[PDB]
């Protein structure tokens, strides 16, 4: 179950987030915790450090006190309040003063539920504490940011993830190549869950973990193939391009969105002129719309390879 | 009821999917099942192999344990949880350790319901197991892919379906012709349920199963007619084409989308130049949008036959 | 602790609220107080004037009598009733007839608790008085508005805050620029706590308080950057713009909405022609739609920087 | 229930409609009734005088004969025809020759149902009669106007409604102020039902009926607020205006249409130049369209406050 | 009941339709009737001549045989077929060979019901005959036009209606002026029902029938007023125009459509340049749309007077 | 009576239907006839070839045996069964084995009557034969298609009709121009009866058969007029255009749809640039929408001639 079995066990073990951790460490020496607001992309380590933060302060007795719950399940803020009263009357067993509750997906709620936090903030800051996880800070109404120290998680930098990917490997006897790592990171988007999980799935199989074995397991074209199809499209060979994208869409079985996504990437990282690149993206912008409005995948897609083959002359 | 009466009874019997089955077999020798994630087009064999997988592991006592339910019926994830507790307390009767629940249409739910899986994964991996079927893997939030072995079902090729269709016939004393088979496949889109079901419906009637008897039972324009209308359109005979498509749209009573769809197919499998085929498809891509935005069927359609009749010279 | 150390000490010292104060002064000459209902946005000076109102009537002996408490903490209306009997039996020491209790967040309660006020209104209007603070008057059930003089606080207008910001500076030897001020107000949302507090945080640092030093301390896109990216986009440098917006979106980690928002602001407060400014906003209006329909953030956004770089010529 | 308890009891008692009544009286002396067509805004007295007209001709025995039904409930023209045969065979008990049926919302039906009237007109003009109420005469197909005397109800002026509102009060021991009356009329749109009904609802509560108590009970922005927001918008304070309208839109929870409506009113009754008022209204006319086409409420609205803040200089 | 009491009683008595009648007379001398197709605007005399045609051929015994029914009441084509068998077995009593059935609103049906005519055409052309009335010929599927002599009724010319209006008057002792006639014809649109019916309503009242008394009874502005408001609008006096249109809309109480209609007429028959007239109509074209989509009458209207007052300079 | 006097007298003489005839000829050499199923649009030659098929097999003695009857006249399938027993007992006089019955409008019947065919199929395939004509094959329940050779008549292509029109002329001393022909086909809809019949009606008159003489005899807008009005509109003469379209709409009394239709046609077959032609049709596409939504015919139409006269410069 890798993404768990490698849940960092200490602040020091969460990586790529010096930014936060460096200064979240200065909360363990003093044993102060104001209500934490963790904000960032998903799979970057809010839940992780919000464990390892609860873990560095309680030693061995965290699981007893800390509880993670998803804030977006609307009718349970008020059903998990009796957990707020047993938890707040119990003194941290050992020698610590305070206690923690984690709240994933905070930024899903409308103004109201957000308030109910507040009458356990000033009632329990000599006992309880909240850690709020949210995709964006902007989406949490001011009255809470008010009483929160705030931490912006960044999508995890290259080397720092690449290194911890290796550790996960060497220690699991899996052979990635250089190819497979770099590729496991085109994939990852800077999101461990995605990265670990993928690696896991390539590890499951037979041995050497190639560039490809990775592109395949996630269903994401070899970037060579994309810029081959965008190219043979621009050349004028419509039926040929259509062929490719088809094969291409079954080899790995991507959604429409998924294809239009990589079409983007590889359109951006073409080395063609800033003058044409626009035309291409503008229209891709169109196509992606059509699809989300629920028009037809096959037709809009091919209909975009069609686009490219007009700009032949 | 053919589509059932030929539900594969063993992993060996599910075809065209070596890919998955080959390595899904290595889960019966060991008697390991992690939560399965079946992803692919519809009518390729997720439900099928997710039966024959439950069937190969329990012998004669599968029906008792395995239950398929559709995950998209939003208010019943939590109403079919009491099926999760009776099922999880019952030991597989005979000599096996584990048990299975199938969940069609997983990729219809928003983040939340997806989580509720998780507190029966680590609670029941010494007892219960889930098999998740989904159109695309991309659409199932990472936290689950996390705890799933994943299988990408591919559309089952021509011959392999054509062969199993015959088996379904010979063994049911139905006379298809060659026409009727090839036709039964234009239809099928590479989707058995659609294919079997249609055959069934032609079998029900009187005897010989023709090209036509198949185009009729599914309501679908003869491909000759389409490429006749697209042809007389291109030649310049606008009023004539408009006539055809009209007659055509009542003979079988197709939607706008439906017409625009076969218009595509037959525009692609025209033997005209990769140069013009684009112009046609680019514009079809336009029409189809118009329509889904809710503009006017008759007008946009005829408006597209108009298109084709400018490119006369 | 600025927000406190500059709590106005007299009705005269609360600003931008002439509206209320002008006519709340005519309650100090007569020494009449009916139950006050303060309504307005948060951070505009209900609590403040509800102090300076208690302060102008008791001189030096206010703290002894006046007590602020939060009304939303449901189980304490009735636990802070013994404060209602000691307080109501004590005659205002000196030469005044009456006494005051402040109740923040009144508009959080359901019908019932609201009533319990009433049997201390007609029992204590020859002794006690309430000041009720609420986000909106509409939310306080009629039977109370009934026995309340009512005051609508308005978000503190520009100049009035800008002036009192300056007084807070000159008297604290802090150098704001014009930029800093105006920026300190883009920030402030018309909410002093936010404003003072921020200013504080910029004063803490080294000297001159710039437009930027303010956008930094609160964490927001520097308006310089936006109008730099919209510029380099309009110039034709699409890849460069895309680059900026990307860095830009991580430096601060804004949503799509969030970016489309500042994109707007800085599109409006561009000094370009009313002729083009439309084109821009019309299309932004489009983008923002796409996004809310759930199309793709990265694609629509870059797809709009694409837009801007067609209008190069 | 005021709106009923003050249903006029005689033609004399229906007010502001001399126009009609004056000449509808000349139908009681002669005891002639051709099929009446009442047309006008809603809440002006069609139903009312169509009662008091039935009441002035039958004395005490009207309720027995006269029946009002709503004509827009499509499948009941033909289900309330057996009421047409029992009613038409019964002679007006006492000494009168004829009888009446009222039909609210006539102008909702398509051509067909309208005809079915006709074979009870020439069949029952020596017995039955219809009174048709409709928003506009233009909307009732000629073949009926044909056989109808027609009456155009006009919106009942200010004073005349203001006077009858007082009568409804004085005689019900309710204390309106001047404010509350004038306000109860901003509200009323010149439509009693709305006006009475609202008053009723303010009467229900505690005592004095203020300007406010009226704006509240109907949920409607204080006109001061609107022209404050339109003002601070015009001055240049976009963020401030956006703030107001937001607060404003929750305080009372208005639709987009609803806001755009009062925006109109107060834009018209601004005391600004006939020169600019146009620019404002032209654009409002734009916004309101956008919205009804289903574009985005928040964006178009704010987008219109944006408009007003360009015309600063 | 004028529109009936002046139902022409012979072909000779139907006016303005020489066109048809001239050659519909040549069917009475021969006593031939093929199935008649009457097509034209409403209220021009299809039903009328289709009576007077049935009346000129049967003398005194028409009512017995001829029956008019509305074809659009879908479930009764087949319920009024037993009227087709009693009617077809009965020989025209006296000395004539054939018989007639009239069918109003033919052009409302879909293809199918249209056919059911046909098996009583060739079955009853030695006995029965149909007269089909329809707004437009184009809307009646060919297979019927096939077996129909066809007659296009034109909106009734000026003098021919004006003359028969007079006859209706002199013979009813009503005093129209020249004004009132001409005006009763601006009104009429070339549609007697509308014209007669209106006259009737002006006759009902007191004596002299003026230009105005006519504009009032139909709710249609004095054309002077319109071109006054369109003028004071174009001059720049927005509030003044808005005032007018308001008064104007109550004086006669027109719909939105109704106002936009006359706005059209009087915009066309302005004597302004063909260059501006366009701008005005283009926008009116817009406004009328907005309204039919259900946007707001008051706002779009005024919003169009707003338009006109921009084009001041 | 042309449509008859040119009823083809041999399979060779039926034209444009090679398709069928080519392979319906191979039934005369062998003298085999299984039950024929003719399907196609009306007026394409089912009845015709179903005569000339009966005519090529019997020589001079067809009329005696063959009988056409209409199948939709419900109560006569069973009344024309005694024609089935006299006909089936009579041996084809001369030297042929079999005999024929034609059944127009087959596709009008419900399941039941369809069966009664069957007990004269296997009872008379050594004597009798049926030829079934139907608008669509899809509409004839399978159990019959079962025992039918099937033939799809196609709308008679351009040249093939144009040629046989000429033969009808040259051999009748009538002078069509090229114009007349091409026009006689715009008319014909690809339906001879319509075409021959019309030609007939133009031949009747004086000499040369023009484009016009044809548009007249059938009643349609002269295509000259349309492209005159669209022209004078584009030139800038709005009032003049409006005038034309008005006259134009009464001369023939077209619907809005009807006018928008020819507007299209003549917009397409304008010889203007593919660049403007779009602008035109895009807007026509708009207009036609407005209308179907039920906005105002006169206003939208003139409002579109307005459109055309902006694009003057
Ligand atoms: N920043 C990180 N450093 C090291 N390991 C990580 C990090 N992020 C995730 N992992 C591993 O990947 C899994 C995902 O953790 P985590 O991101 O906290 O869960 P999440 O809530 O779904 N995404 P997030 O909201 O950013 O926390 C964890 O259980 C970790 O073991
Ligand atoms: N790949 C396949 N191999 C063998 N038989 C199949 C296959 N796909 C379908 N069939 C037969 O056709 C029926 C439909 O197949 P299957 O895809 O397994 O279930 P489904 O309800 O139609 N859709 P899905 O979600 O793809 O599983 C089954 O009951 C099978 O017996
Ligand atoms: N013009 C009026 N004169 C006197 N009383 C009125 C008038 N309009 C309304 N009222 C009182 O207010 C109530 C509503 O009036 P009225 O218009 O007659 O019926 P309605 O159901 O509200 N709408 P409508 O379709 O205009 O008749 C009535 O029951 C009247 O007693
Ligand atoms: N052309 C006419 N000449 C003389 N009187 C007419 C004419 N049209 C209508 N009238 C009178 O006005 C009434 C309307 O008649 P008519 O137009 O036949 O009914 P309609 O069906 O509603 N309109 P239409 O469909 O054109 O016949 C009649 O009953 C006539 O008395
Ligand atoms: N394909 C053809 N070749 C030659 N003449 C034709 C053809 N189709 C029609 N005609 C002439 O036009 C008339 C109509 O054709 P025909 O099909 O016999 O009448 P119809 O029955 O109304 N059409 P249908 O019902 O589809 O057969 C005939 O009597 C023929 O003379």
UniProtKB/Swiss-Prot annotation, chains A, B, C, D, E, F:
Keywords: ATP-binding, DNA replication, Nucleotide-binding. ATP binds at residues 40-47. GO terms for cellular component: DNA replication factor C complex. The keyword ATP-binding applies. The keyword ATP-binding applies. Signal peptide: none annotated. It comes from the Archaea. Belongs to the activator 1 small subunits family. RfcS subfamily. GO terms for molecular function: ATP binding; ATP hydrolysis activity; DNA binding; DNA clamp loader activity. Part of the RFC clamp loader complex which loads the PCNA sliding clamp onto DNA. The complex possesses DNA-dependent ATPase activity which is further stimulated by PCNA. Heteropentamer composed of four small subunits (RfcS) and one large subunit (RfcL). Both subunits interact with PCNA. GO terms for biological process: DNA repair; DNA-templated DNA replication. Pfam families: AAA (PF00004), AAA_lid_RFC1 (PF25361), Rep_fac_C (PF08542). InterPro entries: AAA+_ATPase, ATPase_AAA_core, DNA_pol3_clamp-load_cplx_C, DNA_Rep/Repair_Clamp_Loader, P-loop_NTPase, Rep_factor-C_ssu_arc, Rep_factorC_C, RFC_lid. This is Replication factor C small subunit.
């Amino acid at each position: 179950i890798w993404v768990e079995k490698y849940r960092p066990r200490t602040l020091d073990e969460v990586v790529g987030q010096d930014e936060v951790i460096q200064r979240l460490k200065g909360y363990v020496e003093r044993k102060n915790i104001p209500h934490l607001l963790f904000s960032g992309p998903p799979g970057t380590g809010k839940t992780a450090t919000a464990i390892a933060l609860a873990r560095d302060l309680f030693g061995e007795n965290w699981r007893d006190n800390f509880i993670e719950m998803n804030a977006s399940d609307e009718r349970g803020i008020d059903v998990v309040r009796h957990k707020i009263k047993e938890f707040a009357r119990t003194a941290p067993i050992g020698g610590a003063p305070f206690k923690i509750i984690f709240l994933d997906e905070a930024d899903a709620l409308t103004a109201d539920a957000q308030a109910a936090l507040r009458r356990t903030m000033e009632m329990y800051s000599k006992s309880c504490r909240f850690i709020l996880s949210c995709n964006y800070v902007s989406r949490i109404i001011e009255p809470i940011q008010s009483r929160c120290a705030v931490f912006r998680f960044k999508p995890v930098p290259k080397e720092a993830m690449k290194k911890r990917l290796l550790e996960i490997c060497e220690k699991e006897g899996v052979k990635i190549t250089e190819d497979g790592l770099e590729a496991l990171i085109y994939i990852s988007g800077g999101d461990f869950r995605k990265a670990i999980n993928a690696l896991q799935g390539a590890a499951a199989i037979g041995e050497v973990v190639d560039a490809d074995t990775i592109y395949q397991i996630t269903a994401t074209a070899r970037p060579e193939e994309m810029t081959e199809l965008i190219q043979t499209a621009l050349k004028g060979n419509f039926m040929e391009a259509r062929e490719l994208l088809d094969r291409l869409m079954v080899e790995y079985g991507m959604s429409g969105e998924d294809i239009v996504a990589q079409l983007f990437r590889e359109i951006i990282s073409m080395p063609i002129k800033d003058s044409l690149k626009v035309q291409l993206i503008d229209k891709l912008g169109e196509v992606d719309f059509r699809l989300t409005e629920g028009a037809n995948e096959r037709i809009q897609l091919d209909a975009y390879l069609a686009y490219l083959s007009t700009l032949a002359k």
